[PDB]
Write an enzyme that holds these catalytic residues in place. Structure first.
Site, PDB file in Angstrom:
ATOM      1  N   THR A 285     -27.961  61.359  45.211  1.00 19.22           N
ATOM      2  CA  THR A 285     -29.254  60.859  45.665  1.00 19.22           C
ATOM      3  C   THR A 285     -29.079  59.662  46.593  1.00 19.22           C
ATOM      4  O   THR A 285     -29.612  59.643  47.708  1.00 19.22           O
ATOM      5  CB  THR A 285     -30.124  60.480  44.466  1.00 19.22           C
ATOM      6  OG1 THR A 285     -30.324  61.630  43.637  1.00 19.22           O
ATOM      7  CG2 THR A 285     -31.472  59.950  44.929  1.00 19.22           C
TER       8      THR A 285
ATOM      9  N   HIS B 152     -33.583  63.643  44.002  1.00 14.90           N
ATOM     10  CA  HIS B 152     -32.888  63.477  42.735  1.00 14.90           C
ATOM     11  C   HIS B 152     -31.763  64.494  42.653  1.00 14.90           C
ATOM     12  O   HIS B 152     -31.922  65.643  43.073  1.00 14.90           O
ATOM     13  CB  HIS B 152     -33.833  63.629  41.535  1.00 14.90           C
ATOM     14  CG  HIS B 152     -34.326  65.025  41.314  1.00 14.90           C
ATOM     15  ND1 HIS B 152     -33.585  65.983  40.657  1.00 14.90           N
ATOM     16  CD2 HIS B 152     -35.492  65.621  41.659  1.00 14.90           C
ATOM     17  CE1 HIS B 152     -34.270  67.111  40.612  1.00 14.90           C
ATOM     18  NE2 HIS B 152     -35.431  66.918  41.211  1.00 14.90           N
ATOM     19  N   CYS B 153     -30.623  64.051  42.127  1.00 19.76           N
ATOM     20  CA  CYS B 153     -29.535  64.954  41.783  1.00 19.76           C
ATOM     21  C   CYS B 153     -29.615  65.252  40.292  1.00 19.76           C
ATOM     22  O   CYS B 153     -30.382  66.122  39.868  1.00 19.76           O
ATOM     23  CB  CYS B 153     -28.180  64.349  42.159  1.00 19.76           C
ATOM     24  SG  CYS B 153     -27.915  62.639  41.591  1.00 19.76           S
TER      25      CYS B 153
ATOM     26  N   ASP C  34     -16.827  70.213  49.398  1.00 17.51           N
ATOM     27  CA  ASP C  34     -15.682  69.440  48.949  1.00 17.51           C
ATOM     28  C   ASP C  34     -15.637  68.090  49.661  1.00 17.51           C
ATOM     29  O   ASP C  34     -16.271  67.881  50.700  1.00 17.51           O
ATOM     30  CB  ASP C  34     -14.384  70.206  49.197  1.00 17.51           C
ATOM     31  CG  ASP C  34     -14.448  71.638  48.706  1.00 17.51           C
ATOM     32  OD1 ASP C  34     -15.286  71.935  47.828  1.00 17.51           O
ATOM     33  OD2 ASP C  34     -13.657  72.471  49.199  1.00 17.51           O
TER      34      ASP C  34
ATOM     35  N   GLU D 109     -25.406  74.004  37.833  1.00 17.59           N
ATOM     36  CA  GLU D 109     -25.725  72.954  36.872  1.00 17.59           C
ATOM     37  C   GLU D 109     -27.109  73.152  36.268  1.00 17.59           C
ATOM     38  O   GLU D 109     -27.301  72.951  35.063  1.00 17.59           O
ATOM     39  CB  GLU D 109     -25.611  71.584  37.542  1.00 17.59           C
ATOM     40  CG  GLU D 109     -24.177  71.186  37.853  1.00 17.59           C
ATOM     41  CD  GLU D 109     -24.076  70.098  38.905  1.00 17.59           C
ATOM     42  OE1 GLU D 109     -22.940  69.788  39.326  1.00 17.59           O
ATOM     43  OE2 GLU D 109     -25.129  69.558  39.315  1.00 17.59           O
TER      44      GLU D 109
END
Length: 282
Positions: free
Chosen positions: A224, A216-217, A170, A104
């Site tokens: 988070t 933080h994501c 997952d 990401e």
């Protein structure tokens, strides 16, 4: 029964009512507001509580769930890197937990700068990143760790430990185990750096606003909050603290989106089931 669908349903019902109450109104006096049109929030409907905002420049919030004190924020925008780095330095950040995956961060479309894996200069601040260890969290999930050195003229040079989860597991017992291992890794790394500041007589140990782990994501409300909840259950002080409590505290102190997805609440429910911890308040 204590962890069956009926208990889940009542928990979801209470958290949903709280989210509706915490829903931002237009120019909501409870939430930080952008100035001059400058982009403050990475996401429109995911805003920052004004009572607990760390800086008017950032989407970041002081959060204390039980006795666990952290800072939950969004992945800093490019225009926020200098103020973001200033937050981490003035905080004496014992650990920076980045929950965005390497896939990401590398995707230019998402606008998440690679601010912790490379050297750079942002305003009058100079940053240097050095990769240290790699800690396996289980299920093939690896956590790359870095020592982030923040320098500014006239300012004390601050090193910030970083824990970056490169990939996410997952759904199921892989995610709750990895989250459990991540919380222990973030607590241990923080406790080592915090103790270091304590052995040097740093006045930051007496400030409740400082020495807080930063998590933080991407928007600071999903993984988070899932990690922040796993950390307060990992804290011995937070006994008998319910899932309703910690999700309520996370939402009242940041926004009603904390624990955004059922899968993330599900991870908290499973971890609390592993401790015999209550889900609901009597």
């Amino acid at each position: 029964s204590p962890y069956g669908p009926e208990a889940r349903a009542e928990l979801s019902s209470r958290l949903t009512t709280l989210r509706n109450t915490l829903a931002p109104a237009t120019n909501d006096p409870r939430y930080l507001q952008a100035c001059g049109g400058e982009k403050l929030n990475r996401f429109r409907d995911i805003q920052c509580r004004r009572q607990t905002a760390v800086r008017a420049d950032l989407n970041a919030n002081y959060i204390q769930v039980g006795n666990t004190r952290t800072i939950a924020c969004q992945y800093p925008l490019q225009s926020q890197l200098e103020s973001h780095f200033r937050m981490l330095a003035e905080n004496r950040t014992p650990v920076l937990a980045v929950l965005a995956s390497s896939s990401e961060i590398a995707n230019q479309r998402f606008g998440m700068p690679d601010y912790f894996r490379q050297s750079g200069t942002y305003g009058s601040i100079t940053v240097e990143s050095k990769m240290t260890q790699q800690v396996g969290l289980g299920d093939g999930i690896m956590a790359d760790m870095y020592t982030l050195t923040i320098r500014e003229a006239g300012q004390k040079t601050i090193s910030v430990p970083v824990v970056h989860v490169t990939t996410w597991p997952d759904f199921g017992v892989p995610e709750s185990e990895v989250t459990k291992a991540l919380a222990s890794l973030v607590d241990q790394t923080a406790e080592t750096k915090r103790n270091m500041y304590e052995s040097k007589g740093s006045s930051a140990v007496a400030d409740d606003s400082k020495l807080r782990p930063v998590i933080h994501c991407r928007a600071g409300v999903g993984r988070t909050a899932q990690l922040i909840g796993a950390m307060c259950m990992n804290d011995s002080r937070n006994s008998q603290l319910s899932v309703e409590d910690m999700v309520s505290q996370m939402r009242v102190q940041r926004n009603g989106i904390m624990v955004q997805k059922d899968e993330q609440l599900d991870v908290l429910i499973k971890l609390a089931e592993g401790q015999g911890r209550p889900l609901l308040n009597s």
